[PDB]
Ligand binder design. Structure first.
Ligand SMILES: CCCCCCCCCCCCCCCCCC(=O)OC[C@H](COP(=O)(O)OCCN)OC(=O)CCCCCCCCCCCCC
Ligand code: HEM
Ligand code: HEM
Ligand code: HEM
Ligand SMILES: COc1c(O)c(C)c(C/C=C(\C)CC/C=C(\C)CC/C=C(/C)CC/C=C(\C)CC/C=C(\C)CCC=C(C)C)c(O)c1OC
Ligand SMILES: CCCCCCCCCCCCCCC(=O)O[C@H](COC(=O)CCCCCCCCCCCC)COP(=O)(O)O
Ligand code: FES
Lengths: 123, 54, 93, 385, 74, 248, 50
């Protein structure tokens, strides 16, 4: 269990931590990025998924960034939407971490993170 | 004969195998080092050590 | 020790082959003959006769597969060229 | 009687290496058993003298292999005799499982001898893998990650087995530290299954390259095949010494000298070159659960070989069709060791699916069919009706 | 004293085989420069680059200047 | 993978330590350390090379006790537990320029510059890659390639975009023996030095290998005779068959 | 600190006893060292540095 704070993650810096021996990709978002994330239709994705079932508190972005092909490393604030670009096979990801441009067949997963006030239990 | 001295008793057969592998150990090691350094003259350290002559 | 099963090999004396009779086996000591008596004319004439028999059983299984590997490895390098990206888009998907 | 027969210990030496009647017509392919006995002592003696300097933590694994190669006297000899000698183990053994597959040494009454062969072959694959993950290189961390994540495909018992196998949640300090105490051990299980392999051989004796009874002309082992084994011992020592002193890192992967980092994946994870055919069988099935089975079925399909060979003649020596189709199988096995090295790209997926069908249709379809046709042709060629 | 590779790479640049390659790469580099000025280029997702024509030119100079270079260096 | 993702092939340069009898050019390791200390010691660790390994390879014993006293390592603390420093010695290691990993990525724009102690054996190509990586930088990318900002092109790196810019220009170091310090002379000198850092046994391994293949190919040729000698009774054993009378 | 949970202290009495001391965090994005308050997975700190 990692216990990063509910006041530490800044807006425009992409946190990449090793939780449980695995890379976890964190950002803090703005309220305008909630409707910006799922603005693309589900038909323009290879899997239908909205921002609701992916992220519980859509201001607090919590993502597991092991990619579906090899487990390559996306880079923060790079790509074609201001999200994450995976330079391993060119798998572009949005601010919601879903595959739009690239050969990765599924979205990147989400770990079981829980809010309890002044903390998050990412486990 | 030659057989009656060396190869008859096995106590002196393996005596002159070990005495012929003791001489072969020090000779073949020297004659390989002295060839392998001479094949690479100008590249070893003691050639650079002499060529730093200031 | 306990008695064991029936095997198809015994030991020296009761080896368990068929009974043989009238087979004479002459042999000379190796101290009286020359080893390496025919190392030449066997490395040239005998070793060609062995090669003449068992080489169409090795070459044709390696002339089917090496042609198969090379005709794929030069089709893999055609798809990943600038000239074969309009064919890779129809076979990778 | 003689003291070599009258003693309780020496009569085991006498009945196995001195007075054992071998058939007097066995060619040089019958030395690969004696090489594997020597090549096992090479791995074991250069494992004890190397594990006196090896610390098995995840922080000091790769840093203490380099401590062997830099700080120990003749340490470069030990690490290279044993990383290359392990790759010479699997090349002698692949020529030992292919002598017996060719000369019909799997058939009855030597099915007990063949089944201890497949058991030794599985423990030797499992030994050489568990020591590969002890260097903690980049190909060995991501080798253990790819292999032990295949057991997450077993239904409902997947994740509990893997998390037991890792000893944690990923390949971490308890995995490497237990992949050493296991890898220390399994050679002593191979060294006991080899003694259980000579007992299965000694009851019926060796075969001979004709495939007929060898009870007629038998010569002893001492001074005849002792000195016929010393030719190929001193040759195997020669080709090993070229691959140890003159070109030591030719067989291994270059990425295994990067220290293992779980955050950066390499370009293409491949195992070492001898597991590369089975890695191409594993990768051929477009499913995860069937891949674990078929990669394990490809070692266990050697067991149906005594029951699918329908020939009244032992071995392929005097057969035309079953000698041609044997070398198609060998050069198919080399091709599977090549598709295992290429990436998952067109057309190495249609090849790796076809050239794994020929691995399985050899034992199940080709050998029963072409050996029934090779018995009617032996019959109607001589009988006149 | 100028470097030993670049003049050697300049000497094999203007042979007969090289000038049929360094012109062939330059013909690719012109078709890029008229594609990089057309409208709608930034959102085209199929951009022809000349890494293949550069690789043929660089591999020809690599085979020609590999065994000759180390004789120059002290 | 296309040719760009795979990297351009590293050509076969005629090194002076190739071949089964040639050792390292130890005059090019002493001149290879000086290119290391003055160009890439600023951003590359050499973590596995002790100072004592250089004594008798490229530098003498007095030169390393002055090359190692420039840096400062940690000593065991004083009588009151305060941490104190000390000048180095022969038994210490060649220190990197960055105190941790995050201080390394902060300076070189995110990318971590890899430790060079085993970088010759850890690359496909070997010395022909490390030489041709430094002398592979063109004056511009090929027409059509848009690099990311802060990354440099050379085709021998797998993928094109590397994060190291060209750090070898003509006469940026000055050799101690008057060798002309061009780029091709300097890249040849580090690549021989980093080959010594990766394989510090390359001189003794190739002369014990000479002592073995002479013995193990003369032991093997002796054993063909003693095999053929002790098998001459069975190689030339003759059988005849006089078929017995069937009265029994 | 985790072994004291359930043996002689509750779960909140140890998360307010380990947050009195300070341990070495992993360094920041400029490589400067930094401290953090303790957690349940740390050992009880001794009173002397060496
Ligand atoms: C898990 C499953 C395990 C399966 C293992 C798969 C095979 C492993 C690969 C090892 C290859 C070993 C090949 C050995 C073949 C068996 C030995 C053999 O058959 O040799 C005898 C054969 C003919 O000899 P005969 O005894 O039949 O004839 C007597 C006539 N009086 O003599 C010959 O016909 C010539 C023998 C030439 C051997 C060529 C080997 C090629 C090796 C591949 C190299 C690939 C590079 C392209
Ligand atoms: C059938 C017997 C064995 C086989 C096939 C085998 C195989 C291997 C292999 C493939 C490696 C990896 C080499 C590398 O990539 O560098 C290795 C490493 C190692 N093995 Fe073995 N091994 C055997 C027996 C043993 C024994 C008996 C021991 C210890 C007593 C041992 C101890 C080690 C150690 C310490 C390493 C250290 C990592 C290294 O330096 O390579 N091995 N072994
Ligand atoms: C450490 C590994 C092994 C050792 C030390 C070993 C040992 C031996 C020895 C000494 C012999 C007698 C010499 C000979 O017949 O060639 C033999 C025979 C045999 N071995 Fe093994 N073996 C090993 C692995 C295997 C494997 C992996 C297989 C098959 C899958 C196998 C199958 C056989 C067979 C079939 C024979 C009998 C061949 C015949 O005499 O007709 N062995 N083994
Ligand atoms: C003689 C000088 C140098 C040599 C031989 C050298 C060698 C290397 C090598 C072998 C690599 C790895 C390339 C690969 O993995 O394919 C590398 C990467 C790198 N070098 Fe250098 N280096 C030198 C100087 C420098 C200097 C002075 C810097 C200063 C900033 C630098 C920064 C980097 C960085 C940031 C990388 C990582 C690039 C990446 O992995 O994307 N290098 N260097
Ligand atoms: C059928 O006829 C036969 C036949 O009978 C036999 C036996 C063989 C030969 C095969 C073998 C001998 C294989 C058997 C192999 C083993 C039993 C492996 C055992 C090997 C070992 C090395 C045992 C382990 C013991 C040690 C490692 C002790 C060494 C001590 C060390 C390293 C510690 C050193 C420390 C100090 C302080 C000196 C044949 O090849 C053969 O066909 C001709
Ligand atoms: C244990 C693992 C398997 C190892 C496989 C080795 C199989 C061959 C063993 C060779 C032993 C030779 C002894 C024969 C003998 O003593 O005959 C003796 C005399 O033979 C000799 O003098 C041979 C000279 C010594 C040879 C030295 C070889 C050592 C190399 C070791 C390599 C293997 C470890 C009796 O022979 P005779 O009965 O014909 O008179
Ligand atoms: S890692 Fe290859 S596509 Fe995401």
């Amino acid at each position: 269990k990692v216990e990063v704070n509910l006041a530490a993650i800044p807006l425009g810096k992409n946190v990449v931590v090793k939780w449980q021996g695995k890379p976890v990709f964190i950002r803090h978002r703005t309220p305008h990025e909630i409707q910006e994330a799922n603005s693309v239709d589900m038909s323009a994705l290879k899997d239908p998924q909205t921002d609701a079932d992916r992220v519980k508190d859509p201001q607090w972005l919590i993502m597991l960034g092991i990619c579906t092909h090899l487990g390559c490393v996306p880079i923060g604030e790079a790509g074609d939407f201001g999200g994450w670009f995976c330079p391993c096979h060119g798998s572009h990801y949005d601010i919601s971490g879903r595959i739009r441009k690239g050969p990765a067949p599924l979205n990147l997963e989400i770990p079981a993170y829980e809010f309890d006030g002044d903390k998050v239990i990412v486990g | 004969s030659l057989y009656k001295t060396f190869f008859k008793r096995n106590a002196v057969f393996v005596g002159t195998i070990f005495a012929g592998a003791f001489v072969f150990q020090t000779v073949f090691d020297t004659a390989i080092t002295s060839w392998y350094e001479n094949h690479n003259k100008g590249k070893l350290w003691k050639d650079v050590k002499a060529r730093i002559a200031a | 020790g306990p008695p064991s099963g029936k095997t198809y090999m015994g030991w020296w004396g009761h080896m368990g082959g068929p009974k043989q009779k009238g087979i004479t086996s002459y042999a000379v000591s190796p101290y009286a003959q020359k080893p390496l008596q025919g190392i030449f004319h066997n490395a040239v004439f005998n070793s060609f006769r062995r090669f003449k028999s068992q080489f169409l059983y090795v070459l044709i299984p390696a002339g089917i597969y090496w042609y198969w590997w090379k005709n794929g490895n030069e089709y893999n390098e055609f798809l990943y060229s600038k000239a074969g990206r309009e064919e890779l888009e129809r076979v990778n998907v | 009687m003689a003291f070599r027969k009258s003693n309780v210990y020496l009569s085991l030496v006498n009945s196995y290496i001195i007075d054992s009647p071998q058939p007097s017509s066995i060619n040089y392919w019958w030395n690969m058993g004696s090489l594997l006995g020597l090549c096992l002592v090479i791995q074991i003696v250069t494992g004890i003298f190397m594990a006196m300097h090896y610390s098995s933590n995840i922080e000091l694994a790769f840093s203490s292999v380099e401590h062997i190669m830099r700080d120990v006297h003749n340490g470069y000899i030990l690490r290279y005799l044993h990383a290359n000698g392990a790759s010479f183990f699997f090349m002698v053994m692949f020529m030992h499982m292919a002598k017996g597959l060719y000369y019909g040494s799997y058939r009855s009454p030597r099915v007990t001898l063949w089944n201890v062969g497949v058991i030794i072959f599985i423990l030797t694959i499992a030994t050489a893998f568990l020591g590969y993950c002890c260097v903690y290189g980049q190909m060995s961390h991501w080798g253990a990650t790819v292999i032990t994540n295949l057991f997450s495909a077993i239904p409902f018992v997947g994740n509990d087995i893997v998390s037991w196998l890792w000893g944690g949640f990923s390949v971490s300090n308890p995995t490497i530290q237990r992949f050493f105490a296991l890898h220390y051990l399994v050679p002593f299980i191979i060294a006991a299954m080899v003694i259980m392999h000579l007992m299965a051989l000694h009851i019926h004796g060796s075969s001979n390259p004709l495939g007929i009874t060898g009870n007629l002309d038998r010569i002893p082992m001492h001074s005849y095949f002792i000195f016929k084994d010393l030719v190929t011992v001193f040759l195997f020592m020669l080709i090993l010494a070229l691959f140890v002193f003159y070109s030591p890192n030719t067989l291994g992967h270059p990425d295994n000298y990067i220290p293992g980092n779980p955050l950066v994946t390499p370009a293409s994870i491949v195992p070492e070159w001898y597991l590369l055919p089975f890695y191409a069988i594993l990768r051929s099935i477009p499913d995860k659960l069937l891949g674990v089975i078929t990669m394990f079925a490809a070692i266990l399909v050697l067991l149906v070989l005594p029951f699918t060979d329908r020939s009244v003649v032992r071995g392929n020596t005097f057969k035309v069709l079953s000698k041609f189709f044997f070398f198609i199988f060998v050069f198919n096995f080399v091709l599977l060791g090549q598709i295992g090295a290429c990436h998952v790209e067109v057309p190495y997926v249609l090849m790796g699916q076809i050239a794994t069908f020929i691995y399985f249709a050899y034992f199940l379809i080709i050998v029963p069919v072409i050996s029934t046709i090779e018995n009617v042709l032996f019959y109607i060629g001589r009988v006149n009706k | 004293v100028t470097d030993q590779l670049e003049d050697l790479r300049e000497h094999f640049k203007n042979t007969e085989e090289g000038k049929a390659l360094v012109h062939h790469y330059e013909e690719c580099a012109e078709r890029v420069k008229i594609q990089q000025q057309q409208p709608g280029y930034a959102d085209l997702e199929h951009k022809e680059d000349c890494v293949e024509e550069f690789f043929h030119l660089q591999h020809y100079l690599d085979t020609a200047t590999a065994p000759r270079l180390f004789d120059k260096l002290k | 993978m296309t040719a760009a993702e795979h990297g351009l092939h590293a050509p076969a340069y005629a090194w002076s330590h190739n071949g089964p009898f040639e050792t390292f050019d130890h005059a090019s390791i002493r001149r290879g350390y000086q290119v290391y200390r003055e160009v890439c010691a600023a951003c590359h660790s050499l973590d596995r090379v002790a100072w004592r390994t250089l004594v008798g390879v490229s530098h003498t014993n007095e030169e390393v006790r002055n090359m190692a006293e420039e840096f400062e390592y940690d000593d065991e603390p004083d009588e009151q537990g305060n941490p104190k420093k000390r000048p180095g010695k022969l038994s210490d290691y060649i220190p990197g320029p960055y105190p941790n990993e995050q201080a390394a990525r902060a300076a070189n724009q995110g990318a971590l510059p890899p430790d060079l102690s085993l970088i010759v054996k850890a690359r496909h190509g070997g010395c022909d890659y490390i030489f041709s990586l430094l002398t592979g930088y063109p004056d511009e990318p090929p027409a059509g390639v848009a690099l990311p900002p802060g990354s440099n092109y050379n085709p021998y790196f797998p993928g094109g975009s590397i994060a190291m810019a060209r750090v070898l220009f003509d006469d940026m170091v000055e050799y101690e023996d008057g060798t002309p310090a061009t780029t091709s002379q300097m890249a040849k000198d580090v690549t021989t030095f980093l080959n010594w850092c990766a394989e510090p046994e390359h001189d003794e391994r190739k002369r014990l290998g000479l002592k073995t293949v002479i013995i193990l190919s003369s032991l093997y040729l002796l054993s063909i005779w003693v095999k053929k000698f002790k098998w001459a009774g069975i190689k030339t054993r003759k059988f005849v068959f006089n078929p017995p009378k069937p009265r029994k």
